[PDB]
Amino acid sequence: PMARTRYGPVIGKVEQGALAFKGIPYGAPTSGSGRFMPPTPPQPWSTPLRAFDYGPTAPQSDPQDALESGAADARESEDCLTLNVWTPSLNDQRKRPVMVWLHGGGLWRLSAAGDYQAGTHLAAHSDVVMVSPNHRLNVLAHAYLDEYDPAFAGSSSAGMLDLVLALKWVRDNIEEFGGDPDNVTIFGQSGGGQKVSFLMAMPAAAGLFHKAIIQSGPAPLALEKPYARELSARLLTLLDIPKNRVRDIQNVPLDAIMRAYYQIFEELGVMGVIQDFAPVVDDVALPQHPFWNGASPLSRDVPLMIGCTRTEMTEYFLASNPGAAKRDFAAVTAQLEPVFGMQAPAVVAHYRATHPTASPWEVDALIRSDWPTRLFTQRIADEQVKLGGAPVWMYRMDWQTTARDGLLMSPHAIDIPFVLDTVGTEPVEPGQLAEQQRMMQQMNNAWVSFARNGNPQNKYIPPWQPYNSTSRPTMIFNLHSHMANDPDGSDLAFLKKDLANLEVVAGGVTH
């Protein structure tokens, strides 16, 4: 299938009734004079480009690990501004909803590739157009070089401006791929939800999307200049670049950049509390924290669907602490001291009181899901509804896998196949295939109805009232779903009493 773009024609493939285009360039290479600068459109091509394969992965690996190892090369590249489109049709003016998927991996890892997150089924089954861009990550995306040379104003948001350029590509081109440029939903999980959070406050992105979904990935805070300065000072020193000649950083080899990055990454961590290279409140690309000090009025009229899973961090914590599920309550408390300090026994005691039949592992799992994911999720929703504009829809995903003897429960990312209609691409435990298909039918139809109609209600779930910050009505997704007011609300209330004294972002937030 041949489609036209502003920069030249592309050829896709027919896959399962849908048209699939992979690796379409939307920006120029970012090496050389593009490094730590905003993206630019690509140079146009004349003959049709075969968009048959995913584009290059953004640089993210440690060059030390690739030496004397037996892994297939990742083929990471600074020429990574490509995107994928899955669509039922080309330029027929039927104005299908456009769902722009922002991949996960914090702001630092991964890519849009992989069966579990392909848009084939969404396109063929739901008559939507799905777009997923790659973009710069980690230090190439978010180095704070503004104060070294005026040319680098906004540098810590370069990787977010990549996504803005991808959204301009959609505006200018999606009609050729059967989509409505006036009905664009941005959505993402984990780091993808963090990317949605930042875009909601970015002046450059305003008007380029109309709806937003944040799935297990709140970012109500950015970095502030003091801590970002410390990161970029270390980067320049480790690369032997004096403050005076910072532009020379654009011509050092990529390996030297990535080695220095990991040098810094080592000497520095609960997920969701940002401490790596990230966007800065810099008054150029990002004028405020996304939500902590108030939601941006830029997105007052953007409806938002937002939520998280019940036990987000079980798999991640076990993968970092394989014997963790054996701990008793004293050990659970002791290993929460780095997070809650003096208040760790009080927190564990509170959760034992509100969950009196929960094991130590289950208590620990609820605490580590609530802090920071569910607390931050609630904060974003509270700040958005305070704008008094478009509605907000809150959910919590409570379905449990039986994996690893019941220890995982409702972990991070387990619901990606439910929302994307890709069940089977991820593990399925014996006796749970029909359950996952039922979870998909409920959640996929909610995502699609939100994109198509502006309201997630659908015939497979009960009526879903918009969120407010007094009774806090929340959709509980499970094999049979149901609304609940302020689910386990006293747990978050307890954490909020201690909030002024917890680390919420590296370097803190000015008030």
Side-chain angles (χ1 to χ4, degrees), residues 1-14 16-246 248-511:
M2 178 147 138
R4 298 185 290 191
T5 82
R6 179 193 208 171
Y7 307 106
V10 292
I11 306 159
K13 302 166 99 103
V14 183
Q16 313 186 42
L19 313 177
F21 301 80
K22 300 181 177 136
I24 298 174
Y26 74 86
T30 69
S31 55
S33 59
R35 199 183 276 161
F36 313 109
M37 316 273 314
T40 58
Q43 282 180 282
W45 51 97
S46 51
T47 60
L49 183 178
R50 291 145 56 260
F52 296 167
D53 284 318
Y54 292 111
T57 298
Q60 57 190 254
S61 288
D62 191 336
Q64 298 198 329
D65 280 85
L67 273 157
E68 318 281 61
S69 98
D73 193 19
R75 301 307 275 147
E76 302 168 10
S77 163
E78 288 183 278
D79 194 6
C80 58
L81 305 184
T82 74
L83 58 77
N84 315 305
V85 182
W86 294 264
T87 177
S89 205
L90 301 184
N91 199 332
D92 57 20
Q93 298 291 308
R94 289 180 57 98
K95 299 196 181 192
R96 303 169 180 77
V98 177
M99 300 186 80
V100 180
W101 174 252
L102 307 179
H103 70 78
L107 308 175
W108 305 283
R109 305 305 190 251
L110 297 187
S111 79
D115 297 341
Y116 77 101
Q117 60 181 346
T120 314
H121 292 162
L122 266 177
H125 301 166
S126 298
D127 193 41
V128 301
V129 177
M130 184 171 140
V131 181
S132 58
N134 279 357
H135 62 118
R136 290 175 276 187
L137 305 175
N138 59 77
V139 68
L140 297 177
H142 306 298
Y144 177 64
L145 304 178
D146 301 37
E147 304 172 359
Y148 293 109
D149 184 313
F152 291 108
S155 48
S156 62
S157 279
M160 293 306 306
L161 288 176
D162 292 346
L163 297 176
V164 171
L165 191 63
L167 292 167
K168 298 185 168 184
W169 186 95
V170 170
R171 183 192 62 196
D172 293 345
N173 292 286
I174 215 66
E175 277 183 21
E176 308 281 351
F177 295 85
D180 187 359
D182 294 345
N183 185 16
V184 174
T185 300
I186 54 174
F187 67 138
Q189 189 271 351
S190 196
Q194 294 179 306
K195 293 163 200 180
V196 172
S197 300
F198 287 111
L199 289 164
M200 276 189 82
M202 279 181 73
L208 296 171
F209 61 98
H210 313 90
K211 302 154 195 177
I213 309 171
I214 296 169
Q215 179 188 355
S216 297
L221 291 151
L223 295 179
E224 290 185 1
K225 298 186 168 144
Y227 179 80
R229 286 179 196 125
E230 185 54 55
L231 290 181
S232 57
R234 291 169 191 251
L235 174 72
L236 286 180
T237 298
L238 298 168
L239 294 167
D240 182 40
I241 298 180
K243 169 275 169 272
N244 266 0
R245 254 209 318 280
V246 65
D248 298 344
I249 204 172
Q250 294 191 310
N251 304 306
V252 315
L254 176 60
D255 283 13
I257 298 290
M258 293 321 291
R259 277 193 208 251
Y261 167 66
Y262 273 96
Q263 279 204 204
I264 302 175
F265 190 84
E266 289 171 26
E267 325 170 349
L268 118 203
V270 334
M271 326 205 327
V273 169
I274 297 180
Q275 62 188 219
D276 204 1
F277 286 90
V280 177
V281 187
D282 66 359
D283 319 310
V284 176
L286 190 61
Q288 51 169 81
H289 289 290
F291 292 88
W292 197 262
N293 293 327
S296 175
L298 297 172
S299 301
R300 183 188 318 273
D301 294 321
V302 175
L304 172 65
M305 172 146 77
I306 179 165
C308 65
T309 73
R310 189 172 161 274
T311 68
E312 288 267 0
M313 285 306 150
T314 50
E315 206 169 12
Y316 274 105
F317 192 77
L318 271 172
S320 189
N321 308 267
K326 310 254 209 273
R327 294 166 311 153
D328 65 21
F329 275 123
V332 160
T333 304
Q335 300 180 16
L336 283 163
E337 184 301 319
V339 178
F340 295 104
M342 279 212 198
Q343 312 326 303
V347 177
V348 171
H350 172 84
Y351 278 72
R352 282 176 74 182
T354 57
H355 309 269
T357 69
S359 75
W361 176 248
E362 291 152 356
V363 167
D364 196 47
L366 293 171
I367 295 172
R368 293 178 180 277
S369 193
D370 286 348
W371 179 258
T373 301
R374 199 162 74 101
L375 193 153
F376 279 11
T377 293
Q378 180 191 79
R379 178 55 162 271
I380 290 188
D382 288 347
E383 298 281 1
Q384 187 67 19
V385 297
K386 196 165 193 222
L387 289 174
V392 177
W393 280 278
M394 190 81 99
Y395 71 87
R396 198 181 69 196
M397 201 311 287
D398 282 13
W399 177 81
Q400 299 186 326
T401 177
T402 62
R404 291 185 65 171
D405 266 279
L407 294 174
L408 297 192
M409 288 174 292
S410 304
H412 191 80
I414 205 156
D415 49 355
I416 294 178
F418 307 161
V419 306
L420 298 181
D421 192 1
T422 62
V423 171
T425 62
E426 316 259 56
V428 177
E429 293 291 314
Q432 290 203 300
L433 177 63
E435 291 194 11
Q436 292 205 24
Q437 287 163 340
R438 168 60 180 169
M439 273 336 285
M440 187 288 291
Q441 165 183 69
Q442 292 173 96
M443 282 189 85
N444 178 241
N445 275 287
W447 263 239
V448 168
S449 186
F450 184 68
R452 177 135 57 228
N453 304 312
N455 189 312
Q457 283 170 151
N458 66 85
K459 63 186 167 187
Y460 302 107
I461 57 176
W464 186 353
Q465 296 72 25
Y467 185 79
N468 69 60
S469 56
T470 61
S471 62
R472 297 174 190 289
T474 303
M475 192 31 93
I476 305 296
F477 280 125
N478 207 336
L479 294 178
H480 305 94
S481 295
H482 71 278
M483 294 291 305
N485 289 326
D486 203 13
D488 301 294
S490 84
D491 298 348
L492 301 179
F494 198 88
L495 296 177
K496 281 189 289 188
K497 274 63 154 183
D498 199 28
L499 189 55
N501 317 132
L502 287 155
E503 183 176 46
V504 294
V505 64
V509 46
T510 301
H511 278 306

